Amino acid sequence: RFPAREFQRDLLDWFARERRDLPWRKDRDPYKVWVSEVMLQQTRVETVIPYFEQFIDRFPTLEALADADEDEVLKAWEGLGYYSRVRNLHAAVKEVKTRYGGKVPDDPDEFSRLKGVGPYTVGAVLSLAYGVPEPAVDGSVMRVLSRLFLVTDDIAKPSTRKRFEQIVREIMAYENPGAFNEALIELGALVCTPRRPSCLLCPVQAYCQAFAEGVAEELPVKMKKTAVKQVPLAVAVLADDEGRVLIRKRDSTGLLANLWEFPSCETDGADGKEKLEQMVGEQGLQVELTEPIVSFEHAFSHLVWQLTVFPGRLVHGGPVEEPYRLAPEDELKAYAFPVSHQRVWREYKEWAS
């Protein structure tokens, strides 16, 4: 029904000619392939490249990552977003070392069991690093296959991904699965792009039903994103006479987990300075707050923070208890802060000067 060999030949030959020389493509070490694949989840290649180089220089082997402190690993991810990815990777490499002696499982079922590894990552790492013929369907590959085969099912449904995986299992080049899987990904990045695909240059134009019917710009089908909640947030920047600043570590469950922040309160529409003073008072801390110096927004995928920054002076009436920490200005650089709170500090320092 489908001329698989003709398709594979046109695809893999194109790939050998156009493949980009990306940093994680220098070899097939499973640890390096796995790190790159996790960083690339909902993150563009050009964004990842500098993070990857810095991460692998700090954590050159799987055992190095496993043996590192969680705060050092989070700092190496700082700014990349979706920070549970790195907490899950860190737990997963620890299990690979403790349990499997440091060798990344080559069994799909075993690799699939590690935290942060789902169907795409299983297929990506095992096909590239070990030759295992598991499909590696990400959103780009879903777009490619939805066009090639004129599939109009919503690609957000998990069932749709399962259908695409079966398609790949039938058309795959079982002789070189890693190259086949990489080539579909590279086709989606360089040719079969979300808007204005370059169908006239495409190596597999011969086999594309969407091109035949003239509807490539209309695939894949995907539900429009649900609007997000708006969340007002009040943030205190508190310094003592010696210049040190009060920061606190977020809880390990939920939004921006285990990152550091300036003390803050979801006002839920209430007065900021009032609610902020109640919260700090609950702790050795005597604090008087200033009028707000700036307000700005910060987007997440699922909500938007509306931040207002309030300066204040801290006088020590007791010890600073966890989760809080008193940090000299010169030491703040050592802590991993979300981008929102990086901006809080930037705005505080511009106002001060």
Place this chain on the structure above:
DNA sequence: AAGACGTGGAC
């Protein structure tokens, strides 16, 4: 199933 979960480009 569908919401939680960051951030930044390209239109």
Place this chain on the structure above:
DNA sequence: GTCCAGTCT
């Protein structure tokens, strides 16, 4: 402004 670059729950 919209859309795009997976996994846990």
